[PDB]
C-alpha cells in the first residue's frame, strides 16, 4: 500500500529474455501455422469467429516496439495464439497438433526462464 512495498524484482534483463523465448518459438519446426497473420480475405469463417487475431510477426513488432509494459501481457500475447488455434482446429489435424505441441514448448521455456 502507500510506502509499503514488497522487495524490488529485478526484470532489467526481461525484454531480452522474452526476445530470446520468441526466437526459439519461430525456429521450432512446427512453428509455421504461427510466423504470419491468418489471410482474413481467404480464411472463410476466421474473422468473424476470432475475435483477436494473434501471430508471431505481430508479437515481434510489438516487442520490438516497447507496446509490451511487462512480461505478463507478452505471454498473455504468446497464450492468445494458442488458444485461437484450438477454437479454429480439430485436435487430430496438423495444425491442430502443431499448436499443442508449441505450447508446450512455450510453457516449458517460460517456466524455466522466469519461475
Same mark, same amino acid.
Given at each position: 500500500?502507500?510506502?509499503? @512495498? #514488497?522487495p ?8 531480452? %529474455?522474452? !526476445?530470446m523465448?520468441?526466437?526459439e518459438? =519461430? /525456429?521450432h519446426?512446427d ?5 504470419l ?13 476470432? @475475435? #483477436? ?9 510489438? %516487442?520490438? !516496439?516497447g507496446?509490451?509494459?511487462?512480461? =505478463? /501481457?507478452?505471454?498473455?500475447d ?8 484450438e ?13 499443442h ?15
Amino acid at each position: 500500500s502507500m510506502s509499503v @512495498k #514488497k522487495p524490488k524484482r529485478d526484470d532489467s534483463k526481461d525484454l531480452a %529474455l522474452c !526476445s530470446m523465448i520468441l526466437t526459439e518459438m =519461430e /525456429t521450432h519446426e512446427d512453428a509455421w501455422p504461427f510466423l504470419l497473420p491468418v489471410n482474413l480475405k481467404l480464411v472463410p469463417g476466421y474473422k468473424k469467429v476470432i @475475435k #483477436k487475431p494473434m501471430d508471431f510477426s505481430t508479437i515481434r513488432e510489438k %516487442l520490438s !516496439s516497447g507496446q509490451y509494459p511487462n512480461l =505478463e /501481457t507478452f505471454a498473455l500475447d504468446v497464450r492468445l495464439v494458442f488458444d485461437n488455434c484450438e477454437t479454429f482446429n480439430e485436435d487430430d489435424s496438423d495444425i491442430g497438433r502443431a499448436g499443442h505441441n508449441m505450447r508446450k514448448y512455450f510453457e516449458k521455456k517460460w517456466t524455466d526462464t522466469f519461475k
